[PDB]
Amino acid sequence: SGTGLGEVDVDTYLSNLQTKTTLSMIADGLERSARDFDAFLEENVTLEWEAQRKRIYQHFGIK
Amino acid sequence: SGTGLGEVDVDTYLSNLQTKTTLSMIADGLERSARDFDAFLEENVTLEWEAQRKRIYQHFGIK
Amino acid sequence: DTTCQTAAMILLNALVHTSRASVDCPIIDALNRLNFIGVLVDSLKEILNEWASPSQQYTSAKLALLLQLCQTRQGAKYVLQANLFRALEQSGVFVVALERHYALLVALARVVGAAVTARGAHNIVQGRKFLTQHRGLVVHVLKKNAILAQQALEERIEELAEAFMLLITATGFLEYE
Amino acid sequence: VVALERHYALLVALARVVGAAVTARGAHNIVQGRKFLTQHRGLVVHVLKKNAILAQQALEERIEELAEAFMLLITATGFLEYE
Incomplete structure (x- = not known):
C-alpha cells in the first residue's frame, strides 16, 4: 500500500517540525527556569529556620 | 395514649427554650447588622460611579 | 463568661447605631476615654485562633462593631490612631467551612475599606501599602466572581x-x- | 480545573518578584512590603489556609x-x- 494513509504533505510536514521544535524549546526553557528557581529557593532556605517560618504563622494565624 | 411519646422533661424543656431564644436573638442581631451594612453601602454607592468603579479595574486588570 | 461578653458586645452596636440617627456622637467618644477602643484593637491580634460555635459568633459581633465606627467621620480619627494596620498583620490571617473563611476576610476588608475612605487623604498612604504588600490575593477574588x-x-x-x-x-x- | 491553575501561576510569578526584591537590599524595602500585605490583607490568608487527578x-x-x-x-x- 501507500500513496497516503493518515499522512501529511511536505509543506505541512516542515511546518509541523518547526512548530514541534519551537514548543520543545519553550518547554525546555520553562523547565530550566523552574529548576533554577527551585534550586535558588532551596539554597536560600536551607540556611536555617526551615520549619519555624511556618510555625510562627500557624501559631499567629488561625490554624 | 401519653406518659411520653418522643417528649422531653421540664428541666430540659426550659433549657431548650432558653437556647432557642438565644439563637433567635443572635440570628436577628446578625441579620439586622447585615441589613444595616447593606443599606449603608447602597446609600454610599448610589451617589455616582456605579459601574465605572468596576469597569476601570476590568480594563486595567486581566478580564 | 461566654454569653455575657457576647451580649455586651452586640449591645454596644445598638447604642452607637441609634445614636447616629439622633457629624459626631457622644457614645463613640466615651469609648475612647475608657480605653475600650485601644484594648479592642489589641485583641484583633491572633484572631485566627479564636475564629454555631460560641467563639465564632463572638468574633462576629466584635468585627461588626469596628465596622460601624469606621462609618462616621469622627471614628477615623480615634480608630486610625490605634494603629490597626500593624495589628492585623501579626495575626497572619491574610462547602460550609469555606463559606465561614470568606466571612472573616469580608469583615476585616470592610473595616479597612471604610476606614480609609472616612477621613480622606491622610489614610490613603496606608491603604496602598496593604494592597501592595498583599498583592495577588485580591486579584484571585476579583477574577473568581468575574446548591x-x-x-x-x-x-x-x-x-x-x-x-x-x-x-x-x-x-x-x-x-x- | 486547568483555567484556575494558570491563574495562580500568574500570582506566583508576581509574588516571587516582590518577595525576592524586599529581601534583597535590606531594611530599605521592608517599608513597602508591609504596605502590600496590609493593603491586600485577607487574600493571602485564604491561600495560607487552603494548603494547611x-x-x-x-x-x-x-x-x-x-x-x-x-x-x-x-x-x-x-x-x-x-x-
Missing part, C-alpha cells in the same frame, strides 16, 4: 470582591500604577 | 508555592513585629 451552600459561598465572593474594589477607587491605587 | 495535583502544587511565597516575605519583612 444552597454554593449560592451562599458565591455571595461572600461578590461581597469580598466588591469590598476591595471600593478601597481601590477610594484610595486611588490606579494613579500609582 | 493530574490537573488537581498541578493546581495544589501552585497553591503550595503561592502560600510559601508570601510566607518568605513575611519573615523577611518582619510583619510579625508590627502585629
Whole structure:
C-alpha cells in the first residue's frame, strides 16, 4: 500500500517540525527556569529556620 | 395514649427554650447588622460611579 | 463568661447605631476615654485562633462593631490612631467551612475599606501599602466572581470582591500604577 | 480545573518578584512590603489556609508555592513585629 494513509504533505510536514521544535524549546526553557528557581529557593532556605517560618504563622494565624 | 411519646422533661424543656431564644436573638442581631451594612453601602454607592468603579479595574486588570 | 461578653458586645452596636440617627456622637467618644477602643484593637491580634460555635459568633459581633465606627467621620480619627494596620498583620490571617473563611476576610476588608475612605487623604498612604504588600490575593477574588451552600459561598465572593474594589477607587491605587 | 491553575501561576510569578526584591537590599524595602500585605490583607490568608487527578495535583502544587511565597516575605519583612 501507500500513496497516503493518515499522512501529511511536505509543506505541512516542515511546518509541523518547526512548530514541534519551537514548543520543545519553550518547554525546555520553562523547565530550566523552574529548576533554577527551585534550586535558588532551596539554597536560600536551607540556611536555617526551615520549619519555624511556618510555625510562627500557624501559631499567629488561625490554624 | 401519653406518659411520653418522643417528649422531653421540664428541666430540659426550659433549657431548650432558653437556647432557642438565644439563637433567635443572635440570628436577628446578625441579620439586622447585615441589613444595616447593606443599606449603608447602597446609600454610599448610589451617589455616582456605579459601574465605572468596576469597569476601570476590568480594563486595567486581566478580564 | 461566654454569653455575657457576647451580649455586651452586640449591645454596644445598638447604642452607637441609634445614636447616629439622633457629624459626631457622644457614645463613640466615651469609648475612647475608657480605653475600650485601644484594648479592642489589641485583641484583633491572633484572631485566627479564636475564629454555631460560641467563639465564632463572638468574633462576629466584635468585627461588626469596628465596622460601624469606621462609618462616621469622627471614628477615623480615634480608630486610625490605634494603629490597626500593624495589628492585623501579626495575626497572619491574610462547602460550609469555606463559606465561614470568606466571612472573616469580608469583615476585616470592610473595616479597612471604610476606614480609609472616612477621613480622606491622610489614610490613603496606608491603604496602598496593604494592597501592595498583599498583592495577588485580591486579584484571585476579583477574577473568581468575574446548591444552597454554593449560592451562599458565591455571595461572600461578590461581597469580598466588591469590598476591595471600593478601597481601590477610594484610595486611588490606579494613579500609582 | 486547568483555567484556575494558570491563574495562580500568574500570582506566583508576581509574588516571587516582590518577595525576592524586599529581601534583597535590606531594611530599605521592608517599608513597602508591609504596605502590600496590609493593603491586600485577607487574600493571602485564604491561600495560607487552603494548603494547611493530574490537573488537581498541578493546581495544589501552585497553591503550595503561592502560600510559601508570601510566607518568605513575611519573615523577611518582619510583619510579625508590627502585629
